[PDB]
């Protein structure tokens, strides 16, 4: 048999689909942030199969497992990523950053194919940045884990929002639900202290995201906006508020009252200590104002800024 190549008369350019291309770019982004690509077993133990699941959805078990530890299809990527972390840490690999894109499996009742859903997940523990001789040591915390989930959203041109959530197996105090277009798509959280202790881990952060939901969003082309011709105005405010008010709440009040010129808002400090009524915190927020069509008079800014202050004051937020 001589050697030849097939010549295709329907001519078509071979290209990644859009989803395929986005997935490669996303994996470049995760990797570029220090996360190693994991690949885990789909099959877990039957009592692990529902860990970190969102819905009660039925699980899929094999008829004849080769092995109790690989008996049911996972409804979450995290159990085996946590195991891989425990494994690494017991080998004295203290700095573990892993991500996975992989499928999870929810049962469609009996004799139907399950719902296979693609997830992006990852797990993080140890130092994010080290240079000992310069005193640099940045421990991975919730907010760096958040920073990874945000770098995802940023790269895909999405916006996520975050609201405290209770997920079994995560730290009740350090778990957020991640939402896209007002729908829950996942979560980010420190592991429960008890789960971490079981696995002999330190502070460890996981995130899991419905990547199918993410990929359904049509983002189009990038929206280019010319650089503003005129300078904006920044005002800072320090808002005393009950300790449990999320900063999102105050930011929303500000946007709600910011009319045409309020561009963005940034918390730059939170203070809880003795210099302040117990059960209060002081949250400092930088308000940025901007008109693309005109220069800002102190007085136009003050007018709205005063409206914003009042709305805040009336919702229990003392200056």
């Amino acid at each position: 048999i001589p050697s030849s190549l097939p010549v295709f008369g329907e001519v078509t350019s071979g290209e990644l689909t859009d989803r395929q291309h986005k997935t490669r770019t996303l994996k470049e982004t995760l990797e570029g942030a220090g996360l190693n690509q994991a690949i885990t077993y789909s099959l877990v133990s039957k009592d692990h199969a529902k860990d970190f699941a969102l819905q009660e959805r039925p699980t899929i078990s094999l008829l004849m497992p080769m092995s109790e530890a690989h008996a049911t299809l996972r409804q979450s990527l995290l159990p085996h990523l946590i195991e891989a972390t425990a494994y690494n840490v017991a080998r004295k690999n203290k700095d573990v950053r892993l991500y996975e894109i992989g499928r999870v499996f929810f049962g469609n009742g009996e004799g139907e194919l399950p719902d296979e859903v693609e997830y992006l997940s990852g797990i993080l523990t140890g130092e994010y940045v080290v240079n000992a001789w310069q005193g640099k040591k940045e421990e991975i915390d919730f907010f760096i884990a958040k920073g990874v989930v945000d770098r995802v959203a940023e790269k895909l041109n999405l916006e996520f929002s975050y609201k405290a959530g209770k997920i079994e197996g995560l730290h009740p105090g350090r778990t957020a639900i991640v939402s896209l277009g007002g729908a829950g798509i996942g979560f980010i959280g420190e592991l429960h202290p008890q789960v971490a202790a079981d696995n002999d881990l330190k502070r460890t952060y996981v995130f899991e995201l419905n990547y199918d939901a993410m990929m359904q969003v049509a983002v189009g082309y990038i929206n280019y906006e010319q650089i503003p011709k005129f300078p904006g105005v920044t005002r800072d405010i320090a808002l005393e508020v009950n300790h449990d008010v999320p900063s999102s709440e105050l930011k929303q009040i500000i946007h709600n009252n910011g009319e045409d010129i309020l561009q963005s808002t940034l918390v730059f400090d939170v203070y809880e200590g003795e210099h302040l009524e117990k059960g209060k915190k002081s949250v400092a927020i930088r308000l940025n104002y901007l008109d693309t069509e005109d220069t800002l008079t102190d007085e136009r800014v003050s007018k709205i800024h005063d409206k914003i202050l009042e709305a805040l004051q009336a919702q229990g937020a003392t200056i």
Binding site: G14, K27, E31
Partner: protein, 271 residues
């Protein structure tokens, strides 16, 4: 005033530039993903589509549609992970090609590549994992010949193992194809006369391939008097093992960072 501070800067601000840089860490691409991507790239430049589908699959697509009637020695409940009598963890990526074929309603060309996780009812050890990766291809058009298969399998061996790779085609049998072969690449280590990689053989098995069997074409909705096909499969796990000398399959699925973080960098073809 200014020259005086400039000079004090100059005098004061010398650093040992050999000191550790402040590292900006790169994570790795999994070695199995790397091999899968280079094969996709190769096929993209040839006009193919990369296609994904279900990992839990129906007997019909996993087996029947692929010319394993309810009879057969591979349908075997002991060799495959069933969930019901009808539904199993797919044993190869063929069912995805079979389904795509079917939706083409007897119209070509088909030229697809299907990478993904596959499953065997097997105990694990240095050389067996119950969940592994496969890349299949399927090309179906009007005058497809086995020489066209050969030429394509050759680009595959070059892509994976170097521009100087030859292939070898050995008679074999699979139920979905006919003629069928197993395919060796010439050894990329030892140039001829043998080493431990090719087991002093010169030839390393890496692929199976064959002309698609009429029954498979006809079941998909294609006319096998007008259409012919070829298909092939390969194992990224085995390939990466051979390529890198990785000695235990399970290293891929343990995600030791001291294994993973070995695979950060780009590659080329040396000389």
């Amino acid at each position: 005033e200014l020259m005086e501070k400039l000079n004090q800067q100059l005098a004061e601000e010398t650093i040992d530039v050999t000191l550790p840089s402040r590292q900006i860490s790169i994570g790795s691409k999994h070695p199995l993903t790397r091999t899968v991507e280079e094969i996709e790239d190769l096929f993209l430049g040839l006009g193919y589509e990369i296609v994904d589908g279900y990992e839990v699959e129906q007997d019909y697509y996993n087996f029947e549609a692929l010319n394993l009637p309810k009879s057969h020695p591979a349908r075997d409940m002991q060799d495959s992970f069933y969930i019901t009598d009808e539904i199993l963890m797919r044993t190869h990526t063929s069912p995805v090609q079979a389904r795509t074929m079917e939706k083409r309603n007897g119209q070509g060309p088909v030229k697809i590549i299907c990478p993904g996780k596959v499953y065997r009812r097997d105990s694990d050890d240095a050389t067996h994992s119950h969940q592994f990766t496969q890349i299949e291809g399927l090309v179906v058009d009007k005058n497809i010949k086995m020489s066209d298969l050969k030429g394509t399998l050759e680009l595959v061996a070059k892509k994976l193992f170097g521009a100087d790779r030859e292939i070898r085609l050995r008679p074999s049998y699979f139920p979905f194809t006919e003629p069928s072969v197993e395919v060796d690449v010439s050894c990329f280590k030892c140039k001829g006369k043998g080493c431990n990689v090719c087991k002093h053989t010169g030839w390393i098995e890496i692929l199976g391939a064959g002309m698609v069997h009429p029954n498979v074409l006809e079941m998909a909705g294609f006319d096998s008097n007008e259409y012919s096909g070829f298909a092939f499969g390969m194992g990224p796990d085995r390939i990466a093992m051979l390529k890198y000398g990785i000695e235990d399959i399970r290293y891929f699925y343990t995600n030791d960072v001291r294994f993973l973080e070995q695979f950060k960098a780009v590659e080329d073809r040396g000389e």
